[PDB]
Amino acid sequence: SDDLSFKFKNFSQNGKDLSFQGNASVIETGVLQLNKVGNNLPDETGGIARYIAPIHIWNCNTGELASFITSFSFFMETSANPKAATDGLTFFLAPPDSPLRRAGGYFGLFNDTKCDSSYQTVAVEFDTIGSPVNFWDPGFPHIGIDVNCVKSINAERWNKRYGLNNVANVEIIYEASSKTLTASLTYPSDQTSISVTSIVDLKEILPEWVSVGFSGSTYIGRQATHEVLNWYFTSTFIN
Amino acid sequence: SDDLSFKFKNFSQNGKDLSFQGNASVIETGVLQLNKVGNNLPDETGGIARYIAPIHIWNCNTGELASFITSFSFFMETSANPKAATDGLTFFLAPPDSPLRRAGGYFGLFNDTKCDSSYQTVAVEFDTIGSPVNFWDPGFPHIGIDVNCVKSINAERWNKRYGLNNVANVEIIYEASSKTLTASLTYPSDQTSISVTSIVDLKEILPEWVSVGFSGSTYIGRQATHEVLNWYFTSTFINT
Ligand SMILES: *[C@@H]1O[C@H](CO)[C@@H](O[C@@H]2O[C@H](CO)[C@@H](O)[C@H](O)[C@H]2NC(C)=O)[C@H](O[C@@H]2O[C@@H](C)[C@@H](O)[C@@H](O)[C@@H]2O)[C@H]1NC(C)=O
Ligand SMILES: *[C@@H]1O[C@H](CO)[C@@H](O[C@@H]2O[C@H](CO)[C@@H](O)[C@H](O)[C@H]2NC(C)=O)[C@H](O[C@@H]2O[C@@H](C)[C@@H](O)[C@@H](O)[C@@H]2O)[C@H]1NC(C)=O
Ligand SMILES: [Ca+2]
Ligand SMILES: [Ca+2]
Ligand SMILES: [Mn+2]
Ligand SMILES: [Mn+2]
């Protein structure tokens, strides 16, 4: 389609408009749980959930690119030590048929640290663990923009908080005219706010039709669960 | 979801968001063709096209029912005498995984004339042929409201027009508070407009999640193609 917008005030267990891969699911409370925690899981574990309908991101015949904006609230919980819990969650755009990749520090989107244009993935990561644990990362939790690689083309310092009382407000926007991708995280309790921005041309990275969604991962020993409360999304070619 | 809205200004051949059944498809001109014509087809032939994602129409947890509005423009083409051409098109809500059924005067939605609650289908029909050809219809072309049966509960007379110069603009609305379903057709060339309405409780007829789409069909000897130019749709539980 040319314009598309949906809004989830909460999720339903028996819903039919979401695709799940890995261990992502909707729990009894009406919350989108991106990954599970328990000893019956592999060392590197995670999940993926995307809206069932592909989004027309750019049109080849007219040479046009769409502008979009999304926003959601999330929270995370861990039985281990906050400073050492892995790995985080991401919001991404990739081909509708992409398979679940490797978990852990790879967010289920990548195979390894080598960059490759064949991924055709554009994600905004909420990376909870950095170096020395993940050598390719800065020495602290951060938010960054990834383009076909686990190495962000840009990142910013993030002071991660855990618990339902520490809900985070996220807002991502892509303005096609200026090829600008901006992401901002805000904690409404005390009003702490952080941002990242990069100039990226989606037209030469992604196919015309992509899927929008989330991914969540963790590692054995430092297990943490990532969850989404609601989701709003809207894209248009006329903006 | 709770809210959903999409707009197709035209359709693309390599689109990935429409699901097809039978002989419906998007042609080179960017138009959605519901059925094809030609002599190498079954006697009763037709097609169906639906948006790929199911719509949350009602909620069993809160007892809420959604309101919706949809609009689209369509036109029909025929090489046979217009008066005799069949069978028409349809805008419908049904289980997302329902199969294509009998075409011809049954629009690909039903098996025959028996009414049955298990169809869980509500459709607004733009029926181009009535009795005696179709014994269950009024004796003339008409636009009607079907609830689990090919026989309408209410219908209004329609003087059908064919050709690209006779495009029709349609608007269908379901207002949850009063349970009113209204459909109106207007020919912009001369402002001729007609409408049909009914009051039906969707929670009692449809499942919580349904697919929305169109169906088109025809018969040998009186073939006609039915085409949609654009489509806008929006549903919400939080009606103003
Ligand atoms: C990510 O890991 C995948 C393995 O799980 C790679 O796919 C494998 O690619 C092999 C070589 O092309 C092929 O023989 C295997 O059948 C396939 N394995 C599976 C399980 O599908 C994948 O490689 C990319 O995709 C393939 C299809 C080729 O186009 C390669 O040139 C690509 O690199 C890995 N992706 C990346 C970006 O490394
Ligand atoms: C519409 O035509 C269908 C095709 O014949 C009917 O389904 C078939 O019905 C048989 C007799 O009831 C059943 O044993 C077959 O398994 C079934 N075949 C297929 C391919 O579905 C259909 O019947 C309805 O659905 C079945 C499952 C029963 O619930 C019947 O009581 C229903 O009438 C026909 N009727 C309808 C309303 O679809
Ligand atoms: Ca990391
Ligand atoms: Ca008829
Ligand atoms: Mn990182
Ligand atoms: Mn009729």
A229 token code pair: 């409360």
B204 is in an annotated binding site: no
Q: Is the peptide bond prior to A97 cis by the omega test (within 30 degrees of 0)?
A: no
3-state secondary structure of A144: strand
Query: Which amino acid is residue B234, in one-letter code?
Result: T
The Cα A217–Cα A226 span in angstroms is 8
Q: Is A152 exposed, middle or buried, given 0-12, 13-18 or 19+ CB atoms closer than 10 A?
A: buried
A38 token code pair: 């328990």
Asked if residues B104 and B87 have their Cβ atoms less than 8 Å apart, the reply is yes
3-state secondary structure of A159: coil
**What is the distance in angstroms between the Cα of A27 and the nearest Cα belonging to chain B?**
15
Render chain B in DSSP notation, one character per residue: --EEEEEESS--TT-SSEEEEET-EE-TTS-EES---SSSS-SEEEEEEEESS-EE-B-TTT--B-EEEEEEEEEEEESS-TTT---EEEEEEE-TTPPP-B-GGGTTTBSSS---GGG--EEEEEE---TTTSTTS-SS-EEEEEESSSS-SEEEE-----SGGG-EEEEEEEETTTTEEEEEEEETTTTEEEEEEEE--GGGTS-SEEEEEEEEEEETTS-EEEEEEEEEEEEESS--
Longest dimension (CA), chain A: 52
Length of chain B: 240
* Residue A3 with chain B: CB contacts under 8 Å: 5-7
A74, β-bridge pairs = A168, A228
The Cα A42–Cα A89 span in angstroms is 18
- The total domain count for chain A is 1
Experimental method: X-ray
> Containing domain of residue A106, as a range?
1-239
What is the CATH number for A154?
2.60.120.200
Nearest CA in chain A to B54: A17
Q: What is the DSSP letter of A204?
A: G
Q: What is the DSSP letter of A105?
A: G
| CB contact burial B35-55 (16+ within 10 A = b; e otherwise) | bbbeeebeebbbbbbbbbbbb
CA angle A169, B62, B198 (to 5 degrees): 120
B36 token code pair: 């094809």
Asked if residues B228 and B85 have their Cβ atoms less than 8 Å apart, the reply is no
Neighbours of A6 (CB within 10 A): 20
Between chains, do A209 and B52 touch, taking CB under 8 Å as contact? Answer: no
Render A10-65 in DSSP notation, one character per residue: S--TT-SSEEEEET-EEETTTEEE----STTS-SEEEEEEEESS-EE-EETTTTEE
Asked if residues A168 and A185 have their Cβ atoms less than 8 Å apart, the reply is yes
Cβ of A110 closer than 6 Å to ligand 1, yes or no, is no
SS3 content of chain A, % helix, strand, coil (to 5): 5, 50, 45
The Cα A17–Cα A153 span in angstroms is 32
Between chains, do A6 and B4 touch, taking CB under 8 Å as contact? Answer: yes
CA angle A53, A66, B169 (to 5 degrees): 70
Among residues A8, A1, A32, the alpha carbon closest in space to that of A209 is found at: A1
Resolution in units of Å: 2.2
B227, β-bridge pairs = B33, B75
| Whole-number CA gyration radius for chain A | 17
A127, β-bridge pairs = A88, A142
The Cα B74–Cα B229 span in angstroms is 6
Tokens 């423009």 map to which residue? B73
The Cα A184–Cα A173 span in angstroms is 9
- What lies within 8 Å, CB to CB, of B51 at 6+ separation is A53, B6, B17, B18, B19, B211, B212, B213, B233
Among residues B213, B191, B192, the alpha carbon closest in space to that of B70 is found at: B213
A236, β-bridge pairs = A67
B154 token code pair: 């209410």
Q: What is the DSSP letter of A83?
A: G
CA angle B205, B206, B211 (to 5 degrees): 150
A45 token code pair: 């574990």
Tokens 């069993």 map to which residue? B60
**What is the distance in angstroms between the Cα of B60 and the nearest Cα belonging to chain A?**
11
- What lies within 8 Å, CB to CB, of B119 at 6+ separation is B94, B109, B110, B148, B149
CB-based neighbours (< 5 A) of ligand 6, an ion = B 127, 137
B4 token code pair: 């959903």
| CB contact burial B89-127 (16+ within 10 A = b; e otherwise) | bbbbbbbbebebbbbbbbbbbbeeeeeeeebbbbbbbbb
Q: What is the atom index within ligand 2 of the atom nearest the CA of B119? A: 37
3-state secondary structure of A176: helix
Cα A65 → chain centroid: 21
Among residues B139, B151, B143, the alpha carbon closest in space to that of B91 is found at: B143
